[PDB]
Amino acid sequence: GGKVQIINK
Amino acid sequence: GGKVQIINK
Amino acid sequence: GGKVQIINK
Amino acid sequence: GGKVQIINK
Amino acid sequence: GGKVQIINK
Amino acid sequence: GGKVQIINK
Amino acid sequence: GGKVQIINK
Amino acid sequence: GGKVQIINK
Amino acid sequence: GGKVQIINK
Amino acid sequence: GGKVQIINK
Amino acid sequence: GGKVQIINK
Amino acid sequence: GGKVQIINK
Amino acid sequence: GGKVQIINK
Amino acid sequence: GGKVQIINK
Amino acid sequence: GGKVQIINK
Amino acid sequence: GGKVQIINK
Amino acid sequence: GGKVQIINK
Amino acid sequence: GGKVQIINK
Amino acid sequence: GGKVQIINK
Amino acid sequence: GGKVQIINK
Amino acid sequence: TENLKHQPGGGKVQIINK
Amino acid sequence: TENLKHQPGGGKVQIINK
Amino acid sequence: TENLKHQPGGGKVQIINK
Amino acid sequence: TENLKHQPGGGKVQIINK
Amino acid sequence: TENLKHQPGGGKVQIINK
Amino acid sequence: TENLKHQPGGGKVQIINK
Amino acid sequence: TENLKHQPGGGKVQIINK
Amino acid sequence: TENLKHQPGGGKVQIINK
Amino acid sequence: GGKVQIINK
Amino acid sequence: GGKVQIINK
Amino acid sequence: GGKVQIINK
Amino acid sequence: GGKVQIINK
Amino acid sequence: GGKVQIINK
Amino acid sequence: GGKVQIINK
Amino acid sequence: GGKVQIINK
Amino acid sequence: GGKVQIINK
Amino acid sequence: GGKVQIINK
Amino acid sequence: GGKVQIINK
Amino acid sequence: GGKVQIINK
Amino acid sequence: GGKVQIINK
Amino acid sequence: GGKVQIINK
Amino acid sequence: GGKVQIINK
Amino acid sequence: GGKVQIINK
Amino acid sequence: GGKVQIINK
Amino acid sequence: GGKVQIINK
Amino acid sequence: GGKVQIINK
Amino acid sequence: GGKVQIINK
Amino acid sequence: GGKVQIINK
């Protein structure tokens, strides 16, 4: 069911 | 059911 | 049922 | 039923 | 005053 | 005031 | 005030 | 105020 | 100096 | 100096 | 100086 | 100087 | 002088 | 001089 | 002098 | 002087 | 059948 | 059958 | 059958 | 059957 | 017949953080 | 007949962070 | 016959971060 | 006959970050 | 800080004499 | 910091004498 | 920082004498 | 930082004498 | 059913 | 069913 | 069923 | 079923 | 100066 | 100065 | 100065 | 000065 | 037929 | 037929 | 027919 | 027919 | 005086 | 005086 | 005086 | 005095 | 006519 | 006529 | 007529 | 007429 992973810095 | 992981700094 | 984990600093 | 864990500092 | 609402289920 | 709403299910 | 809404399912 | 909406499923 | 990790919600 | 990890909700 | 990792939601 | 990793949502 | 944050999971 | 935070889980 | 953040998962 | 961020997963 | 997070030195 | 995250030195 | 993330030194 | 991410030194 | 010897003890560690 | 010897102990580590 | 010897212990590490 | 010897231990590492 | 740790054990040994 | 760690063990040995 | 780590073990050995 | 790590083991050896 | 003479010094 | 004489010094 | 004489010095 | 004489010095 | 017979198994 | 017979297995 | 018979297996 | 018989296997 | 070890000094 | 080891000094 | 090892000094 | 090793000093 | 030893078997 | 040793078997 | 040794078998 | 050794078998 | 003198000084 | 002198100084 | 002198200084 | 002198200084 989706795997959304976000890296922002 | 989704696994959303977020890293922001 | 989702596992959402968030790290922000 | 979800496991939401948050670390912010 | 903005209505800051967060829900962690 | 902006309505900041976040939902972590 | 903009309605910032994020949903992490 | 722009309606910033993001959905992570 | 000094690191400052504020997070204005 | 000195690190300051405020979090204004 | 000093690193500043603010995150305005 | 000093690195500044702001993220204005 | 020495400031270090170390997070793992 | 020495300031260090270490979190794991 | 020394500032270092180290994250792994 | 020394500032370093290291992320792996 | 569930989630598990371990840190073993 | 589930998710698992380990950090072994 | 699920997702898994490991960091082994 | 799922996703997996490993870092082995 | 069956010699079994085990050292599955978690690692040994010295830490220094300051 | 069966000699089994095991050292599956997690690693040993010295840390320094400051 | 059956000699089995094992060292599947996770690595050993020295760290320095400052 | 059966001699089995194993070193499938994860690598050893020294780190320096500063 | 003098953090010391020794393991000068006489070694582990499993013998069999049939 | 003097972080020391020795493993001068006499070695592990599994013998068989049939 | 003097981070030291020795493994001068006498070595692992598995013998068989049939 | 003096990060040292030695492995002057006597070596691993598996013998067989039939 | 064999015979073993072990002399060590 | 063999015979073993081991002399070590 | 053999015979072994091992002399080491 | 053989015979072994090992002399090392 | 001295006869020594050390055997370590 | 000294006779030595060290055997390490 | 000295007779030495070291064997390391 | 000295007779030495080192064998390392 | 007997591992016979007999000495005749 | 007997590993015979007999000495006649 | 016997590994015969007999000495006649 | 016997690995015969006999000495006659 | 000196030393001496015999494994005569 | 001196030393001496015999494995005469 | 000196040393001497014999594997005469 | 000197040293000497014989593997006479 | 057996004259066996064994002297181990 | 056996004259066996064995001297192991 | 056996004259065997074995001297191992 | 056996005259065997074996001297191993």
Curated annotation (Swiss-Prot), chains A, B, C, D, E, F, G, H, I, J, K, L, M, N, O, P, Q, R, S, T, AC, AD, AE, AF, AG, AH, AI, AJ, AK, AL, AM, AN, AO, AP, AQ, AR, AS, AT, AU, AV:
Residues annotated with Deamidated asparagine modification: 8
Domain of life according to the entry: Eukaryota
Transmembrane segments: none
Disease (UniProt): In Alzheimer disease, the neuronal cytoskeleton in the brain is progressively disrupted and replaced by tangles of paired helical filaments (PHF) and straight filaments, mainly composed of hyperphosphorylated forms of TAU (PHF-TAU or AD P-TAU). O-GlcNAcylation is greatly reduced in Alzheimer disease brain cerebral cortex leading to an increase in TAU/MAPT phosphorylations.
Complexes and interactors: Interacts with MARK1, MARK2, MARK3 and MARK4. Interacts with PSMC2 through SQSTM1. Interacts with SQSTM1 when polyubiquitinated. Interacts with FKBP4. Binds to CSNK1D. Interacts with SGK1. Interacts with PIN1. Interacts with LRRK2. Interacts with LRP1, leading to endocytosis; this interaction is reduced in the presence of LRPAP1/RAP.
Protein purpose: Promotes microtubule assembly and stability, and might be involved in the establishment and maintenance of neuronal polarity. The C-terminus binds axonal microtubules while the N-terminus binds neural plasma membrane components, suggesting that tau functions as a linker protein between both. Axonal polarity is predetermined by TAU/MAPT localization (in the neuronal cell) in the domain of the cell body defined by the centrosome. The short isoforms allow plasticity of the cytoskeleton whereas the longer isoforms may preferentially play a role in its stabilization.
Domain notes: The tau/MAP repeat binds to tubulin. Type I isoforms contain 3 repeats while type II isoforms contain 4 repeats.
Protein's name in the database: Microtubule-associated protein tau
UniProt organism field: Homo sapiens
Shown stretch of the complete protein: 589 to 597 of 758
